[PDB]
Design an enzyme around this catalytic site. Structure first.
Site, PDB file in Angstrom:
ATOM      1  N   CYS A   1      22.841  13.127  79.779  1.00 10.27           N
ATOM      2  CA  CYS A   1      22.633  12.165  78.806  1.00 10.27           C
ATOM      3  C   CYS A   1      23.754  12.116  77.785  1.00 10.27           C
ATOM      4  CB  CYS A   1      21.035  12.284  78.454  1.00 10.27           C
ATOM      5  SG  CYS A   1      20.690  14.102  77.834  1.00 10.27           S
ATOM      6  N   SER A   2      23.346  12.133  76.485  1.00  4.34           N
ATOM      7  CA  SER A   2      24.337  12.361  75.405  1.00  4.34           C
ATOM      8  C   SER A   2      24.751  13.923  75.366  1.00  4.34           C
ATOM      9  CB  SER A   2      24.220  11.837  73.979  1.00  4.34           C
ATOM     10  OG  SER A   2      25.323  11.675  73.355  1.00  4.34           O
ATOM     11  N   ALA A   3      23.680  14.721  75.104  1.00  2.00           N
ATOM     12  CA  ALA A   3      23.933  16.066  74.895  1.00  2.00           C
ATOM     13  C   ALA A   3      23.782  17.110  76.227  1.00  2.00           C
ATOM     14  CB  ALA A   3      23.325  16.792  73.802  1.00  2.00           C
ATOM     15  N   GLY A   4      23.049  16.310  77.196  1.00  5.13           N
ATOM     16  CA  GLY A   4      22.731  17.153  78.551  1.00  5.13           C
ATOM     17  C   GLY A   4      21.666  18.091  78.494  1.00  5.13           C
TER      18      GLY A   4
ATOM     19  N   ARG B   1      16.829  14.323  77.461  1.00  5.02           N
ATOM     20  CA  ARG B   1      16.283  13.490  78.878  1.00  5.02           C
ATOM     21  C   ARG B   1      16.771  14.238  80.083  1.00  5.02           C
ATOM     22  NH1 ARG B   1      18.620   7.825  76.515  1.00  5.02           N
ATOM     23  NH2 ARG B   1      17.707   8.115  74.264  1.00  5.02           N
ATOM     24  N   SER B   2      17.964  14.732  80.149  1.00  6.70           N
ATOM     25  CA  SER B   2      18.407  15.527  81.135  1.00  6.70           C
ATOM     26  C   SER B   2      17.503  16.807  81.633  1.00  6.70           C
ATOM     27  CB  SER B   2      19.843  16.237  81.141  1.00  6.70           C
ATOM     28  OG  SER B   2      20.720  15.364  81.008  1.00  6.70           O
TER      29      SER B   2
ATOM     30  N   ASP C   1      15.785   3.726  72.312  1.00 11.11           N
ATOM     31  CA  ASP C   1      16.581   4.140  71.243  1.00 11.11           C
ATOM     32  C   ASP C   1      15.818   5.285  70.723  1.00 11.11           C
ATOM     33  OD1 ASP C   1      19.056   2.574  71.927  1.00 11.11           O
ATOM     34  OD2 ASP C   1      19.122   1.939  69.885  1.00 11.11           O
TER      35      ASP C   1
ATOM     36  N   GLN D   1      14.010  18.599  73.737  1.00 11.22           N
ATOM     37  CA  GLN D   1      14.664  18.653  72.566  1.00 11.22           C
ATOM     38  C   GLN D   1      13.490  18.400  71.308  1.00 11.22           C
ATOM     39  OE1 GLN D   1      17.802  15.547  73.111  1.00 11.22           O
ATOM     40  NE2 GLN D   1      18.875  17.075  71.723  1.00 11.22           N
TER      41      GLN D   1
END
Ligand SMILES: CS(=O)(=O)NCc1ccc(Cl)cc1
Ligand SMILES: CS(=O)(=O)NCc1ccc(Cl)cc1
EC number: 3.1.3.48
Length: 282
Positions: free
Chosen positions: A215-218, A221-222, A181, A262
């Site tokens: 991922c969440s925003a892309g 992690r992406s 997390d 990020q």
């Protein structure tokens, strides 16, 4: 420089924040006018993460062709990726329309549906064989065929049916379930194992449309996933593997989607993964 010694030199000097800021300052800026039209507000998860007009994926539907997704085309490595946000309640039908239209073989998911007590993306695939999903807006049917649950990642076989033509295709869902997390993993060993499983499936190969990565925003992690894959492929293709410059590859990818990697910790993790992956390859 060479990567592994550039690495120890940034660690000893404690300058990850300064290197990361240099990347942010040099990164491309291009118009994202379609993303910002008022009719598209409920198609974006985050107001500060938008696809560039020049590289956006277009839906093959006249009314509204918009999805928050970008084509990353890496010319020297000969790899393409679609990077996209986690689907929203109103965009799960658009998501599967894109997978269909682009001829993708694989979807790579790097987040959990719930993280930090909040929803990071819609439950966009079926959890039980006998309870299939129908997307009435996009005229698609999706069935769970099988599921293989391992300690760090799950692989699912799905059947996607175009209800208009009655055509069917097999889609592989690669779900990395153990990213923490907060922060980044301590070792890149399980992330590299996962990348190798996606490669072995054929999902990244030229026979198929581009892999869909989210991922969440892309972008975070992406970004790490596509940056590590492209750097390891260039190290295999070139006469001099020490010539691969991870900062220059990341700025090339940022011509196609804003914001990739990020945090300074995600940048250090990307270096760690490429360094450890290069040893396993030989
Ligand atoms: C988001 S945008 O398209 O309005 N800004 C990008 C941009 C870069 C460089 C110049 Cl000279 C002008 C504009
Ligand atoms: C073209 S389709 O048959 O796959 N689905 C219809 C549709 C798609 C996209 C939007 Cl934005 C609106 C409607």
């Amino acid at each position: 420089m060479e990567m592994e010694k550039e690495f120890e030199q940034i660690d000893k000097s404690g300058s990850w924040a300064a290197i990361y800021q240099d990347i942010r300052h040099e990164a491309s800026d291009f118009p994202s006018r379609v993303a910002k039209l008022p009719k598209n507000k409920n198609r974006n998860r985050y107001r500060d993460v938008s696809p560039f007009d020049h590289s956006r994926i277009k839906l093959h539907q006249e009314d509204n062709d918009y999805i928050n997704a970008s084509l990353i085309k890496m010319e020297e490595a000969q790899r393409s990726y679609i990077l996209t946000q986690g689907p929203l309640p109103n965009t799960v039908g658009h998501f599967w329309e894109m997978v269909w239209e682009q001829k993708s073989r694989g979807v790579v998911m790097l987040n959990r549906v719930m993280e930090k007590g909040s929803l990071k993306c819609a439950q966009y695939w079926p959890q039980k064989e006998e309870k299939e999903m129908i997307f009435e807006d996009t005229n698609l049917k999706l069935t769970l065929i099988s599921e293989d649950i391992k300690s760090y990642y799950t692989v699912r076989q799905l059947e996607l049916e175009n209800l208009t033509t009655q055509e069917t295709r097999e889609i592989l869902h690669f779900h990395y379930t153990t990213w923490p997390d907060f922060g980044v993993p301590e070792s890149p060993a399980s992330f590299l194992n996962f990348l190798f499983k996606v490669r072995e499936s054929g999902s990244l190969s030229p026979e198929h449309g581009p892999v869909v990565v989210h991922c969440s925003a892309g972008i975070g992690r992406s970004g790490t996933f596509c940056l590590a894959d492209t750097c390891l492929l260039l190290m295999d293709k070139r006469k001099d593997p020490s010539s691969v410059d991870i900062k220059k590859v990341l700025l090339e990818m940022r011509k196609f989607r804003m914001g990739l990697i990020q945090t300074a910790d995600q940048l250090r993790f990307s270096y760690l993964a490429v360094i450890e992956g290069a040893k396993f390859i030989m």
